[PDB]
Design an enzyme around this catalytic site. Structure first.
Site, PDB file in Angstrom:
ATOM      1  CD  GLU A   1      32.902  12.347 -21.670  1.00  0.00           C
ATOM      2  OE1 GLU A   1      31.691  12.345 -21.849  1.00  0.00           O
ATOM      3  OE2 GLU A   1      33.700  12.627 -22.578  1.00  0.00           O
TER       4      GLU A   1
ATOM      5  CG  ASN B   1      26.027   9.276 -28.272  1.00  0.00           C
ATOM      6  OD1 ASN B   1      26.652   8.202 -28.115  1.00  0.00           O
ATOM      7  ND2 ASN B   1      26.240  10.318 -27.532  1.00  0.00           N
TER       8      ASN B   1
ATOM      9  CG  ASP C   1      25.499   7.548 -33.374  1.00  0.00           C
ATOM     10  OD1 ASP C   1      25.021   7.532 -32.217  1.00  0.00           O
ATOM     11  OD2 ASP C   1      26.632   7.055 -33.640  1.00  0.00           O
TER      12      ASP C   1
ATOM     13  CB  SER D   1      25.844   5.037 -30.381  1.00  0.00           C
ATOM     14  OG  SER D   1      26.340   6.359 -30.188  1.00  0.00           O
TER      15      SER D   1
ATOM     16  CG  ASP E   1      28.336   8.506 -25.105  1.00  0.00           C
ATOM     17  OD1 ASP E   1      28.673   7.801 -26.083  1.00  0.00           O
ATOM     18  OD2 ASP E   1      28.338   9.733 -25.142  1.00  0.00           O
TER      19      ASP E   1
ATOM     20  CG  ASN F   1      29.430   5.832 -28.662  1.00  0.00           C
ATOM     21  OD1 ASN F   1      29.583   5.197 -29.659  1.00  0.00           O
ATOM     22  ND2 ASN F   1      28.479   6.770 -28.531  1.00  0.00           N
TER      23      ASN F   1
END
Ligand SMILES: [Cl-]
Ligand SMILES: [Cl-]
Length: 129
Positions: free
Chosen positions: A35, A46, A48, A50, A52, A59
């Site tokens: 990650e 992301n 969308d 959003s 992380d 998220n």
């Protein structure tokens, strides 16, 4: 902060993640590796819109507030910036909620694709712990 492998294992253990919801410490270390490469400051946007955040790339769509993810929740009740701290307490507490949400560590797509079904114990092998 960029953790060492064994250093992160030890911090996770101290915060009660080894075997949390059945997931051995190597699972968590492996997830962190892929990650964030063990960097508490990692952020990634992301598709969308959003974001992380942190060692476990938690998220903003569900778990923390960053003020710029429309129609989001903040289920860990935390600013997303708290997930970037050198102290992993916020990330571990919020990971515990995530992994309890029904799909276990499959919540982390990188865990599913890169850790699940592998010798995750290798990630803590040699560490004093
Ligand atoms: Cl393990
Ligand atoms: Cl599970």
């Amino acid at each position: 902060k960029v953790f060492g492998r064994c250093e992160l294992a030890a911090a996770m253990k101290r915060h009660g993640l080894d075997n949390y919801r059945g997931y051995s410490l190597g699972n968590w270390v492996c997830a962190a590796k892929f990650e964030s490469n063990f960097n508490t400051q990692a952020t990634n946007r992301n598709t969308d819109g959003s974001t992380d955040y942190g060692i476990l790339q938690i998220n903003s769509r569900w778990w923390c507030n960053d003020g710029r993810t429309p129609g989001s929740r903040n289920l860990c009740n935390i600013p997303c910036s708290a997930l970037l701290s050198s102290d992993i307490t916020a990330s571990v507490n919020c990971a515990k909620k995530i992994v309890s949400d029904g799909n276990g560590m499959n919540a982390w797509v990188a865990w599913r694709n890169r850790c699940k079904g592998t010798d995750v114990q290798a990630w803590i092998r040699g560490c004093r712990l």
